[PDB]
């Protein structure tokens, strides 16, 4: 866990730019399966 916090601070999520629901994510994962 030495570099895990550095990985946390590194990741670039500041711009979302997506613009649903978690059950929709469930069926998307099942469909991908």
């Amino acid at each position: 866990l030495i570099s895990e916090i550095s990985s946390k601070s590194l990741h670039n999520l500041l711009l979302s730019e997506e613009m649903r629901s978690p059950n929709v994510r469930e069926v998307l994962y099942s469909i991908l399966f």
């Binding site: 570099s3 990985s7 946390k8 590194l10 990741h11 670039n12 999520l13 997506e18």
Partner: peptide, 30 residues
């Protein structure tokens, strides 16, 4: 934190590629 169950396919790709890139950088000094 913003836990792992909230990100997307490309964001999970960046997570897993950061993990394997850390493993790579740890292994390339051998």
């Amino acid at each position: 934190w913003i836990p792992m169950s909230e990100l997307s396919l490309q964001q999970q790709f960046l997570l897993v590629t950061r993990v394997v890139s850390r493993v790579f950088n740890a292994l390339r000094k051998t």
